[PDB]
Amino acid sequence: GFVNKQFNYKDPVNGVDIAYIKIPNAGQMQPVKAFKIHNKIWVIPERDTFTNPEEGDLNPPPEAKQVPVSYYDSTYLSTDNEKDNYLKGVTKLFERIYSTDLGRMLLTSIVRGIPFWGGSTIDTELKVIDTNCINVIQPDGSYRSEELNLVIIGPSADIIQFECKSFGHEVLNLTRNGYGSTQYIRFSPDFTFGFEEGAGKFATDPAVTLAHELIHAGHRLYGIAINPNRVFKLEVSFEELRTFGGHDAKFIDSLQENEFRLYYYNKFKDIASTLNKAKSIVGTTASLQYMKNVFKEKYLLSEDTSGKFSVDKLKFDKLYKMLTEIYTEDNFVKFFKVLNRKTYLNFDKAVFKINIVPKVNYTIYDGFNLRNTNLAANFNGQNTEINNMNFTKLKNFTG
Ligand SMILES: CO[C@H](C[C@H](CCN(C)CCCc1ccc(F)c(C)c1)C(=O)NO)c1ccc(F)cc1
Ligand SMILES: [Zn+2]
Structure with a gap:
């Protein structure tokens, strides 16, 4: 069991794994009910009008998207019963992924992928970055900050636009500098899109789609996402090709892969030196020794008898390849x-x-x-x- 409590949306708040929370969107928002399905992973059965407060309107745009398929319904996921069904759906999809060895591995990597404590203005001090936390409300109406890795939230306007997104930082490129950041996956288990194989008309297994997004989250939590402006020439980002895998991933040649490989070895080495030079930590509950060990486990660092960290190239290569070539959509298709x-x-x-x-x-x-x-x-x-x-066909949006 990856998710041990079988939450009902009605279940009373307990401020531990059922709570009203606010996300650090840098806006004022009212608290939303959320559910902790596993260490470091929450689910919010709401349409996402939050990660980008500048995306509140759930109505279709005047210019229709051309690819891929799109669909709008402003009323979807507005009632308690859809929220309850949403929650059971996402939980079930997690168990399906976890029931595979590849899924078990992916999910374990995500749980270890704590975003790096690079919040201090002082280069010798570790400190959490607030946008990698949520605020959980307590009985007296105050808020406590809780660290997390992953949030599953309902879609924004386009119900079938799934994506893995996160809050940025002023100078740091958290998803590309090796640090990582908390990831927010817009996803619905209540809809799917078709593909052809006239021709046979099939539906994508939504466990495959979720796994797709979890793979993005994996990259971004480890700060190794590929900049979206790096594209394979139509126009598709390397990050999508990598995530999908199969024949698509071989389009990112041998040379660019080596650059990324070297680039991130160098990142991991920097993180190791930041940890080695750390003399203090901000926060009441975790020791510097404790967080040093958290990041040792994340980046699979080697520890010498004097407590100093380094990167083992063998273990780096394996981790890197694991996150980028093993965890792919194509690979889940095989296992499923x-x-x-x-x-x-x-x-x-x-x-x-x-x-x-x-x-x-x-x-x-x-x-x-x-x-x-x-x-x-x-x-x-x-x-x-x-x-x-099992597949009620909807009118895809054309404008
Ligand atoms: C699981 O969701 C994906 C598209 C969505 C990206 C949305 N945007 C932000 C990125 C690229 C859009 C895109 C998707 C497909 C495509 F053919 C072209 C030319 C472009 C995404 O890749 N999230 O991680 C999908 C792919 C094929 C489908 F048939 C249906 C959905
Ligand atoms: Zn994608």
């Missing part, structure tokens, strides 16, 4: 043994309402492709024309 589109780019627009919460629809083990039934054959379970009761 489901059908998935063959490339990142997908021009065959189709969106569906689904409901993976009932076991008669979708299980942790087989997804839609229920074993020992007609849906285990030929990915029938994902065939939107065979398993049509």
